[PDB]
Amino acid sequence: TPSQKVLARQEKIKAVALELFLTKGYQETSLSDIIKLSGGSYSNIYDGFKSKEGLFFEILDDICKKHFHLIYSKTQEIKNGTLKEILTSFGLAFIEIFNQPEAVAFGKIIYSQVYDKDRHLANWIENNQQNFSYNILMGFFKQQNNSYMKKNAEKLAVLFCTMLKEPYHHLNVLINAPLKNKKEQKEHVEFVVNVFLNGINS
Amino acid sequence: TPSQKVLARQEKIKAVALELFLTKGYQETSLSDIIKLSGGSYSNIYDGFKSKEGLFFEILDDICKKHFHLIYSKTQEIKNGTLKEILTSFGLAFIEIFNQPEAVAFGKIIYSQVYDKDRHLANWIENNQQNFSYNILMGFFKQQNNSYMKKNAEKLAVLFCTMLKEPYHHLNVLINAPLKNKKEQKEHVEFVVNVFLNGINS
Ligand SMILES: C[C@H](CCC(=O)NCCS(=O)(=O)O)[C@@H]1CC[C@H]2[C@@H]3[C@H](O)C[C@H]4C[C@@H](O)CC[C@]4(C)[C@@H]3C[C@H](O)[C@@]21C
Ligand SMILES: C[C@H](CCC(=O)NCCS(=O)(=O)O)[C@@H]1CC[C@H]2[C@@H]3[C@H](O)C[C@H]4C[C@@H](O)CC[C@]4(C)[C@@H]3C[C@H](O)[C@@]21C
C-alpha cells in the first residue's frame, strides 16, 4: 500500500534521527545529517520533518503515546479500587518511567531548547495537553463522590504527579544525579501517597 | 583599605557580568566581553572569575544568600507558632521569590548549561547544600515533638518546597508561562499547606 510505505519511511527518518541524537548529540546533529543517512528515502519532505526540532517532537509524540497506554492499562487493572490502590498503582508506573536513562536523555534535550526562538516546545506543549498522563488521574478524581476532589481534579492530578516526580528528574537532568532503584521507587511512592491522602498529622 | 578596594572591584565585575547577561544574553556573552567592560579594573584575575560560568555562580551565591536571610527573617517573625502558621509563612516568602522575572531569567541560564562538560553547576550544587532554604524548614521539623517529622525532616522539607514550586517554575522557564499574581500565590500556598498537613480525606 502507498500509505504503508509512507509511514514506514517516516519511521526510518525518526529512527535515524534518534540514533544521531544519541550517538552524535542533539545539538551537533543538523537536519542534513538526518536527511543524508536517510538517503534518497527523504529528499525535502512534508510534515514536521522540516527541522530537527520537529523530528524530535514527532518522536516524543510516540513516547508519550506509549507511556499513556502503559499507565492507563496498569490503572484499569484493578476491578476495585480504593483511591489508595489507584494512586499507588499510578505511582509505580509513572515513577518507573522517569527512572529510565531515556527520560533523562530527552530531558536534556528539552532543557537545552530554553533559548529556541521558534517556540517549537511551547507549540508542542500547548497542542498536547490531552496526551499527558495527568489526565488519567484527573479522570478518577471527578468520579469519586466528593465536592473537593471533583472541583480541584486537575490541580490534585498535577500535584500528585509533581510530588512523585520532582525534584528528582530535574536533578537527574541538570547534574546527572543517580536514578532510583526499584526499592527506592516503591518507598517513595508509599511515602508520597500517605502525605497526599492523610498528611503529616498522622 | 586594600581589602575594601578588592571587594569593591569584585562587585564591579559581577555587576558588569549581570548587565551583559541581561542585555546581551548569557550564551553570546564571553569572558572577554566582561573583562573589556570591566576595564583595567580586571586584567586576568583570581577566584571563580576565570570563566563566565564562575562569575555566574558567584552571583547566585549572593542571591541565594539574599533569599535565605529573607525567608529566615519572615519565619522567626512569629513568637508562636503552629506548624500551620510556620508552613504558610514560609510558603508565602518562598513562592514570592519564584514569581519574579529574575527567578525565571536565571532559571533559563541554569537549564541551558545542561550540556556543560565542566560540571560547574554540579560542583556548585554539591558545595552549597547548606545554603538552600530547604534547611530552614528541615530545622523546624526536627524540633516538633514527633518521631516521623524528626526522622524524615529533610524529605518533608524537600517535598513541601517542591509542591509549592513545581511545575510552575519549570513551565515559567521552558515556555515562558505567566507568573502568579499575589492572590494566586496565597491561594496556592493555603492549598498546598492543607494537603500537606491534612490530605485529601478532609
Ligand atoms: C510538560 C511537562 C510538565 C507539564 C505538566 O506536567 N503539565 C502541566 C500542564 S498545565 O499546567 O495544566 O498547563 C514537562 C515538559 C514536557 C515533559 C517532558 C516530555 O513530556 C517528554 C517526557 C517523556 C517522558 O516519558 C519522560 C519525561 C519527559 C522527557 C518530560 C518530563 C516532564 O514531564 C516534561 C519535561
Ligand atoms: C538546586 C535546585 C533544586 C535542588 C533542591 O531543591 N534541593 C535538593 C537537594 S538534595 O536532593 O537534598 O541533594 C534547582 C537547582 C538550583 C536552583 C536554582 C538556583 O538555586 C538559583 C535559584 C535562585 C532562586 O532565588 C530563584 C530560583 C533559582 C534560579 C533556582 C531554582 C531551583 O531551586 C534550582 C534551579
Features:
homodimer, 202 residues, Tetracycline Repressor, domain 2, 11 helices, 0% strand, binds taurocholic acid, DNA binding (chains A, B)
Can you summarize this structure?
Chains A, B: GO terms for molecular function: DNA binding. By secondary structure, the first copy, chain A, is mainly α.
The CATH superfamily title of the largest domain in chain A: Tetracycline Repressor, domain 2
> What structural class should be given to the helix and strand makeup of chain A?
mainly alpha
How would a crystallographer describe the biggest sheet of chain A?
none
Instruction: Give the number of helices of chain A.
Output: 11
- How much β-strand is present in the residues of chain A? under 5%
Helix content of chain A: 55-70%
List each distinct ligand once.
taurocholic acid
Oligomer type = homodimer
Protein name (chains A, B): CmeR
Binding site for cholate (chains A, B): 64, 133, 165, 170
Keywords (chains A, B): DNA-binding
GO molecular function (chains A, B): DNA binding
SSE inventory with pairings:
Two copies of one chain form a homodimer.
Chain A: H1 2-23, H2 31-38, H3 52-76, H4 83-97, H5 101-111, H6 120-126, H7 134-143, H8 147-151, H9 153-165, H10 168-175, H11 182-197
Helix pairs in contact in A: 1-2, 1-3, 3-4, 4-11, 5-10, 7-9
The complex binds taurocholic acid (2 copies).
